């Protein structure tokens, strides 16, 4: 509905007299399919900007795992998403909300962070990337900007040094 | 014809007339409505295709605006064919592709056929309808591509997404149980060959028991099982014949294994007849039934992946080059065969003024059981030279005694131009078929998979099925946002 | 399998019976067979060795399911026709206790024929094109078997022999 979520405020303040305000904004979905799922995830999925800005200014967390049965692979309909709004935010090229989900009035996004299977933004971007050269070029240049502001706003952390739960670097997993 | 000539000024005008709006649902002389006129006039020219699609779509747009509330595609012709059935009947994958590709972004939704629910940017989910497979009150869709088959192309139309994906998932969900059919048939043919192998060598047929034991009683069980399944093969082909009405009227041998099955079944019921007459000649007929069933094992290769692709490959090149190499083989080798029967063998009198053919096919109403083409006392030497003719035995002479040096260089001429110089020809141009049929063999592969599957459930005595809306996952990457207004 | 057959060779040689030798010839053909693993080294022959590794690794079982099955079927067709004393079977030991060697393997007279055991290993040795044209007490009423062998030799011997060579040449067109 034109990207403008207006109800950031009223259940946050009903959830302030009853006291669940970041719990209003960060209610991870307890569905099996939509699991671990916050509204910031939707705000990225709807590709809009009010939703991210007054969802984050509604207090939305950034490092939060969305270990959804909708959101991981089977070789069937459900495929891996990023499972955390920064991860899928990069996996959807959305530098406005990668940039925003860093630049938040509450939270810089942890670049070195991991996800549900251990599948970090390295494994999310790589694992979502296939031989589509549009997909390849976006998952390379978008990842490179994530290493550029990823080496500017939060430098001094070697992200590729991290291996997964299987002990694989993004060089090892991409390879 | 106004739509068939793109003339939207006079389609528009011939609607908007001060006297008469044009009836959209109307039919024509053969029953061939604007559906059948536009489709039937449309050929694979992409200018013709694009005009007969977009012009037809505008006819559905003002065709859905000035006169809405009439479902034109619902109409079938005099033959009972919808425009989906007719466009999917004259082999136009482009138009049928438009029909299931159809998607109207205007009020309101269910004109479309490719719906996208639980869809997503990376993750598209293209929902379909499978009215192609729900068309049971008329024929199914592969039925009407197959009838009439291949006005330009019959094998092409399966590769489109409901037909191909549906033909995949129905096999991998139901009809991968075809191994039970091949299992029962394989055990059947094993029973045939072990009864044939372990038969008694006694001259009198219908022996009571070789021995009252596990052996001969087991052989009686194999006999009763083997004709007890043969009657089921006869029941299957009679359902195929009364129900399917293939083969074609005056046409070629197509399809091959059907009439090969009819000749095996004919020869084995004649085997049953003369076995009921209790003479010894039931057995060569049994070996013929053996070689046609063990021959017919390759029909059961339609199942699984690299071997089904391989099975359609050998189905293609073998189905083409069967008679093509036979007209080389039988004719060159019959000619030069007769040339070798004249040279050389003494006692050259099977003919003329006697019974020349020794009453060829001497068996009344059983077939070619005689001494047909009786030779010049070289009958055994002539079946034997025909057995030399695939390269076995060598180099005899006789009372010619090497004055037939002309026959020597003569055989150097036939063996020259035929044995090497023509042997490389048909292999090479069937390799040109390989240069052309290889991608087409994929269309033949998905088709023959869909005939094993679709004919399998269509025959199965008396079957179940499952009919629910298709949906196809797509993981492709491209931009494009928006919504169908929720 | 070479190592297994040669340590069984060592076992039965330690039992000191004569049958150590056919196992030795099998070890020979699997090692001299295994010489082509040592072709991985140098340039035109290593390129060549990977070529034969590719087309041989693909078309091994693919030609075997044609070969063993067509030739087993028509083989049994020739064992039934023709040889007298057709009793290895049924109600006796049909298989003559096939693989009669306990824990050594297929050492027996397996698939005992219709007194054509030597004529059946011998027709299997004819089956790669050696010997010819015998008859027996059928005595040319098996003209049906004549044209029948013209049918199998027709569709299989020439008409199918060109198939797999051609589509492995399609593999050559791709690999």
Curated annotation (Swiss-Prot), chain C:
Subcellular compartments: Cell membrane; Cytoplasm; Melanosome
Stretches for region Disordered: 87-110
SUBUNIT field: Homotetramer. Interacts with a cAMP-dependent protein kinase type II regulatory subunit (PRKAR2A or PRKAR2B) and ACBD3. Interacts with SLC50A1; the interaction probably occurs intracellularly and depends on TRPV2 N-glycosylation.
Annotated intramembrane regions: 96-132
Extracellular side: 5-18
Residues carrying covalently attached carbohydrate according to the record: 94-95
PTM comment text: N-glycosylated.
UniProt function note: Calcium-permeable, non-selective cation channel with an outward rectification. Seems to be regulated, at least in part, by growth factors, like IGF1, PDGF and morphogenetic neuropeptide/head activator. May transduce physical stimuli in mast cells. Activated by temperatures higher than 52 degrees Celsius; is not activated by vanilloids and acidic pH.
Tissues in which the protein is found: Ubiquitously expressed. Expressed in dorsal root ganglia, trigeminal ganglia, spinal cord (Lissauer's tract, dorsal horn and dorsal columns) (at protein level).
Top-level taxon of the source organism: Eukaryota
Protein name: Transient receptor potential cation channel subfamily V member 2
Range of the intact protein held here: 478 to 652 of 761
Family to which this protein belongs: Belongs to the transient receptor (TC 1.A.4) family. TrpV subfamily. TRPV2 sub-subfamily.
Skewed-composition ranges (Polar residues): 93-104
Residues that span the membrane, as ranges: 19-39, 61-81, 145-165
Gene name of this polypeptide: Trpv2
Cytoplasmic side: 40-60
């Amino acid at each position: 509905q034109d990207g403008v979520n207006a109800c950031i405020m009223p259940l946050l303040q009903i959830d302030k007299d009853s006291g669940n305000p970041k719990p209003l904004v960060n209610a991870q979905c307890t569905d099996e399919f939509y699991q671990g799922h916050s509204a910031l995830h939707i705000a990225i999925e709807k590709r809009s900007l009010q939703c991210v800005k007054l969802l984050v200014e509604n207090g939305a967390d950034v490092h939060l795992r969305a270990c959804g049965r909708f959101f991981q692979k089977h070789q069937g309909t459900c495929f891996y998403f990023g499972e955390l709004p920064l991860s899928l935010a990069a996996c959807t090229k959305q530098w406005d909300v990668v940039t925003y989900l860093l630049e938040n009035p509450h939270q810089p996004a942890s670049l070195e962070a991991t996800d549900s299977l251990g599948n970090t933004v390295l494994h999310a971007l790589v694992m979502i990337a296939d031989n589509s050269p549009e997909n390849s070029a976006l998952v390379i240049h978008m990842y490179d900007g994530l290493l550029q502001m990823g080496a500017r706003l939060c430098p001094t952390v070697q992200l590729e040094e991290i291996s997964n739960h299987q002990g694989l670097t993004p060089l090892k997993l991409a390879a | 014809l106004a739509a068939c000539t793109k003339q939207w000024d006079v389609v528009t005008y011939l609607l908007e007339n001060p006297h008469q709006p044009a009836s959209l649902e109307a039919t024509d002389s053969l029953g061939n409505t604007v559906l059948h006129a536009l489709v039937m006039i449309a050929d694979n020219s992409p200018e013709n295709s694009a005009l007969v699609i977009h012009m037809y779509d505008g006819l559905l747009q003002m065709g859905a605006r000035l006169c809405p509330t009439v479902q034109l595609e619902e109409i079938s012709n005099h033959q009972g064919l919808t425009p989906l059935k007719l466009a999917a009947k004259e082999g136009k994958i482009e138009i049928f592709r438009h029909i299931l590709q159809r998607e109207f972004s205007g009020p309101y939704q269910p004109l479309s056929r490719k719906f996208t629910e639980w869809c997503y940017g990376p993750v598209r989910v293209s929902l379909y309808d499978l009215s192609s497979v729900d068309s049971w009150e008329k024929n199914s869709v592969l039925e009407i591509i197959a009838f009439h088959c291949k006005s330009p192309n019959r094998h092409r139309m399966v590769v489109l997404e409901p037909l191909n994906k549906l033909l995949q998932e129905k096999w991998d969900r139901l009809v991968s149980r075809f191994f039970f059919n091949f299992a029962c048939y394989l055990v059947y043919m094993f029973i045939f060959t072990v009864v044939a192998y372990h038969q008694p060598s006694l001259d009198q047929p219908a022996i009571p028991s070789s021995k009252a034991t596990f052996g001969e009683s087991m052989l009686l069980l194999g006999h009763i099982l083997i004709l007890l399944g043969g009657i089921y093969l006869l029941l299957g082909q009679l359902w195929y014949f009364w129900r399917r009405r293939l083969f074609i009227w005056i046409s070629f041998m197509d399809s091959y294994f059907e009439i090969l099955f009819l000749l095996q079944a004919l020869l084995t019921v004649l085997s049953q007849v003369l076995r009921f007459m209790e003479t010894e000649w039931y057995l060569p007929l049994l070996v013929l039934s053996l070689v046609l069933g063990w021959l017919n094992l390759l029909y059961y290769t339609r199942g699984f992946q690299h071997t089904g692709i391989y099975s359609v490959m050998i189905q293609k090149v073998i189905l083409r080059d069967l008679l093509r190499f036979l007209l080389v083989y039988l004719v060159f080798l019959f000619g030069f065969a007769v040339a070798l029967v004249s040279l050389s063998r003494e006692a050259r009198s099977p003919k003329a003024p006697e019974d020349n053919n020794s009453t060829v096919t001497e068996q009344p109403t059983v077939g070619q059981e005689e001494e047909p083409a009786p030779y010049r006392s070289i009958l055994d030497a002539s079946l034997e030279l025909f057995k030399f003719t695939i390269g076995m035995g060598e180099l005899a002479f006789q009372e010619q005694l090497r004055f037939r040096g002309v026959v020597l260089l003569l055989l150097l001429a036939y063996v020259l131009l035929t044995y090497v110089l023509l042997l490389n020809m048909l292999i090479a141009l069937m390799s040109e078929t390989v240069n052309h049929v290889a991608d087409n063999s994929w269309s033949i592969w998905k088709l023959q998979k869909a005939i094993s599957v679709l004919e399998m459930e269509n025959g199965y005595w008396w079957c179940r099925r499952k009919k629910h809306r298709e949906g196809r996952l797509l993981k492709v990457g491209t931009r494009g946002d928006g919504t169908p207004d929720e």
